[PDB]
Amino acid sequence: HHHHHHATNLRGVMAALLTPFDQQQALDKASLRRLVQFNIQQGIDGLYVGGSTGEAFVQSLSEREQVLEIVAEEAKGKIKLIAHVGCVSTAESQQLAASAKRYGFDAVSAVTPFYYPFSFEEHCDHYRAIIDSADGLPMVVYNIPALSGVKLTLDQINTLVTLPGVGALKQTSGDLYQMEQIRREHPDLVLYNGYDNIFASGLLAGADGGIGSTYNIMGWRYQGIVKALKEGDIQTAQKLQTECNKVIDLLIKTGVFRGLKTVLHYMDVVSVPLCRKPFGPVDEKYLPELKALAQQLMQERG
Amino acid sequence: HHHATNLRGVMAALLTPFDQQQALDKASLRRLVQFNIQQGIDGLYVGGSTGEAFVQSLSEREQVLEIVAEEAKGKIKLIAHVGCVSTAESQQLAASAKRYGFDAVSAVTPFYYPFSFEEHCDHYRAIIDSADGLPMVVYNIPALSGVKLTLDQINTLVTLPGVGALKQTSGDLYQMEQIRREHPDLVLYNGYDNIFASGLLAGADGGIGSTYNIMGWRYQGIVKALKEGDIQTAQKLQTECNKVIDLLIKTGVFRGLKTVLHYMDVVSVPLCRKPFGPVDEKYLPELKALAQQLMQE
Amino acid sequence: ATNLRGVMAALLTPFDQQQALDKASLRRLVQFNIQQGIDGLYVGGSTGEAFVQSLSEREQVLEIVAEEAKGKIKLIAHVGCVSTAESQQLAASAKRYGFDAVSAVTPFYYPFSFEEHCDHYRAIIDSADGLPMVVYNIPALSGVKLTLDQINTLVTLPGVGALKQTSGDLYQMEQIRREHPDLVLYNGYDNIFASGLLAGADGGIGSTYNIMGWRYQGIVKALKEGDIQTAQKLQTECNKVIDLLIKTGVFRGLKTVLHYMDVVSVPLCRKPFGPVDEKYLPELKALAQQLMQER
Amino acid sequence: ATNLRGVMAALLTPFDQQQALDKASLRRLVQFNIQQGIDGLYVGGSTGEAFVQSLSEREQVLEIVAEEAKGKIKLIAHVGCVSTAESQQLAASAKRYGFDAVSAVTPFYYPFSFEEHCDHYRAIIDSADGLPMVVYNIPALSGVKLTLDQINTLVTLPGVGALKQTSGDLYQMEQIRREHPDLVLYNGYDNIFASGLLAGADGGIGSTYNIMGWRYQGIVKALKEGDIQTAQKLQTECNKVIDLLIKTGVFRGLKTVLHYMDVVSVPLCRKPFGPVDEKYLPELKALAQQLMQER
């Protein structure tokens, strides 16, 4: 499918960008800019902006557009930029897609619309409408059954990823039989592994990249896994995945987004490491570990 | 809980009319509000799931809340569903509900992202504060929210200061009985229309539901029949409601209700917002026949 | 199938200190149930710990219960196994012992297609040799998720006279009743019995009927007479007991209550079920005394 | 328990058109596996249709397999039942027949507490009298949802030497390996074998190894050689076969391929399993021919 061929340039390891907030839970613009540069300096292939990790679903459309605009100013032409524009509403999703186009993003993406049960035909129309509003930007279908409640069959996934204008699939599923099945059906499809804690295994199963939240603090590790596997150095790939999972273990305990924001706070990137309500603060007993992790990561990096 | 005793009854979960451009249809909203008042409904639950809240902006939700208050304040009870995923957004809507003179606020357990139980409690606390004296109706709908509260957690939520009711959209009638047993004075709304009679028997003392927009009097009739010990009439009414619900599930529930209301000369354009699609045209004869049946009744 | 309508205790299987069948306690439990005014017994079901018994042990229980109670109350033999052939054996034995009906749980563990489920029931019905089949639906334990349409096909199979509906979905209970006005339809979850009857069930089969079957008969009566408050009160009292039994473990909690009622010598379930925690013994003792004083 | 590390076929149990054990085909299937170069056999498991056989039938199969294979390849006896006592009888029999290890699925149908699962394993381990235990985790069929902490407790019980992990959660696979660097850890889902090895499994137990065990051994080899492309190519070929087997039904599909390889006389599973849809026979025959020519 030629739409898959035309999206070849989107293959890679893309950080799901966090949205920094200030003490009053408004956008912290200076921290957002610092975070974008910090990701570029890690050697990340691109950014996935306004996704789950960006706390999109506790932001308004206007807030999401501001983030999109700022990220484009900072990063357009330097690394790939995918705009997650998905809302429950098709119309809202289209507005964000239109804005992504205006700001010069390389792609758009939409989570399968959630809360209300929609038919598969309704899902397909949703993506079509957003693709039209994206005005040439390729679409990354975003599948995350754990949070969306949307339970697509493989046949449905196949239809979705071959809609005109779709160039990739962000597969946030731990089912690696299905990962292999998708690769086998679509040999040229850009296929992002969505769960960071199985990245090496997802690549082996057929993913050709990833999009993840933990890439913000250790994206070079995931780059290092791609490299190890390409060279056939399985031991280095396993070692890196194991180190990633030790960190993921801690972030699951602390809360993932806020744990990441706190680590980035000790890396001097984020000024105030809060998520938006109803997310609460990181428990203070985890602070030594998170600071320790921040120190560990800079020392292996710098 | 005995304070909020005035919130007991059968409250329609109000639909939000739209036009073919997907804009709010305010004329049809007003007509639908009056249609519900004329049916003898006890109140309206505004901007809930049935109201298509989660495909509207805050401004749109506020516009609807305002119009309903204009139409119905003082005539029937008004509950504003103000729930968003965001606490701050939910607080804005709660403050607006207060301004418009609603009798109560409500919020669905915040969804998509997993939140801890403590995070849920703080969310409700913050909204109650912004409601500034309006009692809170905790809204539990596990099937759509993905939030799996334990009974003990439900107990903690419903006894938070400012909480006067639970909207229990759950088919587990053991838990319905357990909630009634623990909280003898709690206003407890049955949320699944197709078990209303059984929910009342288990302990609910009223309900909030989408199908009440077209046949609210049948649910009042179940309440009446059960108060008089007339099981047979209660069962017959529930069976008739379920015959309708079978059809609505086939057609799509919100858009089916809006189509019935369209044939009743209430709603101009029976559309839901995208990504909801239109009613399959093969169902229109059944939906029209139903409107006629219900009007004659 | 109309004569199968009613309130039937899901009989427990008493065991001795060595986990073998305690035949004397079994006989005592059967009589105890008859004296409570139960309409019948459902023997060798989930509650009977069927799935930790051999086929010969299950036959032994069936034979003895028939000795005790045949002619006096209705007797339904749960003959269900994963294996069809094993299920057929028990069905043939039920017929020999003179049971009024057979029953089989949807076969579990391995996923079977719906037509495989249908063939399974057909085979068991053939082996039942004229005994009506009670289809037994319990999704929470069986893992089998039948659609309403599939339930409709199952309950209309030649030879099927009833459905034991162990589901808390009371929309579906009403739908089943509406589709099949004459079907015998047993409410399976004790803790919604009053509500299940209201939705369309015309009786029930349950584990807690062994210790308070008269309360459920009382709910049927109260509803028949339009005494909704009495029905609700009885359901509430049943649910207070069910709360405790869920804490203690239901089969062993029931056996322990029956032990304090002088019916069951040794109130053990079969391994891997463990014993009742000793800290719940005062509550279960208090419960037996209350129920005995209640009659 | 390093000696248990490897690629072990979950042996199918052949039956005839009467649904009786086909012992001649069992012996042939055992020999066929040995000649494929399999490391061992896991006997009377899910794939062996344990849960539609009597204890005696399961014992007969265990005895025959030991006769054919003892000392030539590793032998693991799946002795698991819902009942602890039944599981203990099979464990004692496995010991008598000279098996290298025993295994038990988490007991299913009735909800048991985690303590009750542990005591179940302790009892089976005692009856195995020195044979190491392979804890068998298969959430999708058993309905038992163990936490990582619970799995950690189980795999460290005295006498446990391995975990059969039939779960597609490869985060947990990695976590288990991280916690227990020396634990024998079998990948249970054949269609993610290469990925499970990468996450931390050090071998596997699977149903499809009966017809293409050498491919899985080839994946283990390719990964140790650091040849990722060959590991992927092999996994892709295994999944093309698995796609077909899932369409046909896996056990009966495997038996049908084996039939065309002249190993199994009658490719039937026991009722309530039905026969293969005849429209799939051309595909299943061609697969047999392909696989015979490849080996």
UniProtKB/Swiss-Prot annotation, chain B:
SUPFAM superfamilies reported in the protein's UniProt record: Aldolase (SSF51569)
Residues bound to aceneuramate: S49, T50, T169, G191, D193, N194, S210
Gene Ontology terms describing biological process: carbohydrate metabolic process; N-acetylneuraminate catabolic process; single-species biofilm formation
Effect of Y112F: No significant change in kinetic parameters for the cleavage of Neu5Ac
pH dependence (record): Optimum pH is 6.5-7.0.
Effect of F254 to A/Y: No significant change in kinetic parameters for the cleavage of Neu5Ac
Gene3D superfamilies linked: Aldolase class I (3.20.20.70)
CDD domains reported in the protein's UniProt record: NAL
Localization per record: Cytoplasm
Modes of activity regulation: Inhibited by reduction with NaBH(4), and by Cu(2+) ions, p-chloromercuribenzoate and N-bromosuccinimide. Inhibited by beta-hydroxypyruvate. Co(2+), Mn(2+) and Ni(2+) stimulate activity, perhaps by enhancing the opening of the substrate Neu5Ac.
Residues at which pyruvate binds: S49, T50
InterPro entries per UniProt: Aldolase_TIM, DapA-like, NanA, Schiff_base-form_aldolases_AS, Schiff_base-form_aldolases_CS
PANTHER family xrefs: N-ACETYLNEURAMINATE LYASE
Family from the record: Belongs to the DapA family. NanA subfamily.
Annotated function: Catalyzes the reversible aldol cleavage of N-acetylneuraminic acid (sialic acid; Neu5Ac) to form pyruvate and N-acetylmannosamine (ManNAc) via a Schiff base intermediate. Experiments show the true substrate is aceneuramate (linearized Neu5Ac), which forms spontaneously at alkaline pH. Linear aceneuramate can be provided by NanQ. Can also cleave other substrates such as N-glycollylneuraminic acid (GcNeu), but not colominic acid or 2-oxocarboxylic acids such as 2-oxohexanoic acid, 2-oxo-octanoic acid, 2-oxo-3-deoxyoctanoic acid and 2-oxononanoic acid.
Name this polypeptide is given: N-acetylneuraminate lyase
